[PDB]
Amino acid sequence: RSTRQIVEFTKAMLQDNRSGEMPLVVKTEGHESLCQKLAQEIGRLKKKGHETIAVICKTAHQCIQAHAHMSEYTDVRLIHKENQPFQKGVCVIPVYLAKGIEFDAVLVYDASEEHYHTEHDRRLLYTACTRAMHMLAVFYTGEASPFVTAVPPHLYQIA
């Protein structure tokens, strides 16, 4: 139900039909520059018509940090419990609460090798990226997750 480009990107992460824009991978220096560039990309995606936009973090604890820092640049809804209603707009949400929800656009928060390197992490990263129906962006600080670096570079564009 996602785009061919998103399906091919995410399939390539598991090394161990509609069309859309290429997944975007974005390198950043630190959580503050990360949150700034996330905020800019959210503004771009809103203008292009995305109505449900998820910044997906690995854990609830990371969500709180992400939400606090993103709030410096834009307004974002923190998703922290199951009974929060699905609505249009921008949210910060952990993988385990995003499971089986579909968003127009997903921005993966800090897909670094520090945060995503175990096989458990691989399942979490895959789950996060497959929530995206129309646009996927993968942001990271420092060094990218091995599961991102492993994706053939023709399957994504860089910023």
Residue numbers in the entry: 608 to 623, 631 to 773
Give sentences copied directly from the paper behind this entry.
Our long-term attempts to crystalize Bsu HelD, RNAP core, or their complex failed; our cryo-EM experiments with the Bsu RNAP core were not successful; also, our recent SAXS-based data for the Bsu HelD–RNAP complex were not fully conclusive. We also solved the X-ray crystal structure of Bsu HelD C-terminal domain (CTD), which was then used as a guide for building the model of Msm HelD. Previous biochemical studies used HelD from Bsu, which is only 21% identical with the Msm homolog. Selected sequence homologs of Msm HelD are shown in Supplementary Fig. 14, revealing two main differences between Msm (Actinobacteria) and Bsu (Firmicutes). The first marked difference is the absence of ~30 aa from the N-terminal NCC-domain region in Msm HelD. The other difference is in the HelD-specific region where Bsu HelD completely lacks the PCh-loop. On the other hand, the organization of the 1A-1 and 1A-2 split followed by the complete 2A domain is maintained.
Here, we present structural data for HelD from Mycobacterium smegmatis (Msm) in complex with the RNAP core and provide insights into its function. Next, we provide biochemical evidence showing that in addition to being able to hydrolyze ATP, HelD can also hydrolyze GTP. Finally, we demonstrate that HelD can both prevent binding of the RNAP core to non-specific DNA and actively remove RNAP from stalled elongation complexes. To summarize, HelD clears RNAP of nucleic acids; this likely happens in non-functional (e.g., stalled) transcription complexes or post-termination.
